[PDB]
Design a protein around this ligand. Structure first.
Ligand SMILES: O=P(O)(O)C[C@@H]1O[C@H](COP(=O)(O)O)[C@@H](O)[C@@H]1O
Ligand SMILES: O=P(O)(O)C[C@@H]1O[C@H](COP(=O)(O)O)[C@@H](O)[C@@H]1O
Lengths: 191, 191
C-alpha cells in the first residue's frame, strides 16, 4: 500500500485577489498553510516521502516549509491562461466576451488565446503520470487545473467531468491506489 | 447641462506620511492645490457654483482658498477607519493581521473595528446624493472613500468594483449627467 498526497500550493497573493494564472508568491495565510501542511506531513510519519513541485513560486514556497528537499517539475506548471493571465472573471468577460461564452460550451477543449487547454495539459502531464504511477510515497504540490488532470486519471473520469472536480485550496487528497482504481481521503487544514 | 465637480481635498500632512484617517491639515503642497484649484475654478467661469465640503480641516482649508463661501456637510466626512485611524498599511498588518486579511476578502462589506464600511458610508451618503442630484453647479470637495461612493452612483458601478475606483489626490472629475448616465472629464492639477 502506498499513498499519493495530491494537494495544491498554499493560497497566493493573486488567489486572494480573485485572479488567475501568474507567478505570485504565497500570501501570509498561504505561508500558514505551508507550515500547516508541514505539521500534517510530520503527523503522518511517512517512510521517505518524495516531494514534487512545479517551477512556480507558490508551490516551491509551500514545499520550503517542509524542511526536506523537493524536485521541481516544469510539466507540473499551471495551465497557461494565455492572454487572460492575471485576470478576474469579470475582466475576462469584459475584454474577452466571446472567448468566455465559447469556453462555457466545451470546457475540456477550450484553449485560451495564446495559451493551452485541459487537453493540452493532459498531453503535458503524460510523463508526470508515468513517473508518479511507479513511485512509492509522493507529495505532489501543484495547482488547480493540474491537480484535476492527475486526480481524474487515478479516479478514471471523463474529459467532460474532469474540469469540474473539487480541488479547493488548503485541502490535501491522500490517494491510495487499490485493485479497483484508487482510494481518496480528503484532508482540510483550517488556517 | 450642469456640472458636478467631484474632487478630493488637497494633500494633507497625514497623506504625506502615508497614513489613513485623522483630521489633519493641508501640507504646504496641499495648500498649493487649494490655490491651484482656485485658479482652475476661475478659469472655468461657472454660474453660481455651490461649494460643499465636510467638517474635516483638509476639505475646509481647500475651500478657503476659493474666496467664495462653502456649506459644510457631516455626511461628507471620510469613512471612519475606527481602531485603525491614523495608521499605515504596515502598522495595520502588524497590529491587526487578521482584520487585514479579512478585508482583502470583501472590500465593500469590510467594517473596521469600532468604525464603518463602504456599505455604512453608502447609507450615510443617501441624503447627500439626494440633494446633489437636484442642484445645478456644485463643487464637492471631499475624500477618497466618499468620492468613490458618489462617483460610483453617477456611473452606476457595482458594490464590488466601487472600492477600486481611481480617486487620486489633486485630480478633479467634472461630472456632467446626461441621458444615458453621466459624462466624466478628468482634470489633473500638477503642483
Ligand atoms: O492553482 P492555481 O494556479 O491557483 C489555480 C486556480 O484554480 C483556478 C483554475 O481552475 P478552474 O477551471 O476551476 O477555473 C484558477 O482560476 C486559479 O488561479
Ligand atoms: O481622502 P482621504 O481622507 O485622505 C483618504 C485617503 O484615501 C484612502 C482610502 O481609500 P482606499 O480604499 O483606497 O484605501 C486612505 O488610505 C487615505 O487616507
Amino acid at each position: 500500500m502506498r499513498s499519493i498526497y495530491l494537494c495544491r500550493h498554499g493560497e497566493s497573493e493573486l488567489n486572494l485577489r480573485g485572479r488567475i494564472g501568474g507567478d505570485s508568491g504565497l500570501s501570509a495565510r498561504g505561508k500558514q498553510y505551508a507550515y500547516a501542511l508541514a505539521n500534517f506531513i510530520r503527523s503522518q510519519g511517512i517512510s521517505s516521502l518524495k516531494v514534487w513541485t512545479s517551477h512556480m513560486k507558490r508551490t516551491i514556497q509551500t514545499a520550503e516549509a517542509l524542511g526536506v528537499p523537493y524536485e521541481q517539475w516544469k510539466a507540473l506548471n499551471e495551465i497557461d491562461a494565455g492572454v487572460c493571465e492575471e485576470m478576474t472573471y469579470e475582466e475576462i468577460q469584459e475584454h474577452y466576451p466571446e472567448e468566455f461564452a465559447l469556453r462555457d460550451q466545451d470546457k475540456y477543449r477550450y484553449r485560451y488565446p495564446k495559451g493551452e487547454s485541459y487537453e493540452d495539459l493532459v498531453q503535458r502531464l503524460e510523463p508526470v503520470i508515468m513517473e508518479l504511477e511507479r513511485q512509492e510515497n509522493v507529495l505532489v504540490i501543484c495547482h488547480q487545473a493540474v491537480m484535476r488532470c492527475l486526480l481524474a486519471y487515478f479516479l478514471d473520469k471523463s474529459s467532460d467531468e474532469l474540469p469540474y472536480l473539487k480541488c479547493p485550496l488548503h485541502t490535501v487528497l491522500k490517494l491510495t491506489p487499490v485493485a479497483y482504481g484508487c482510494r481518496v481521503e480528503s484532508i482540510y487544514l483550517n488556517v
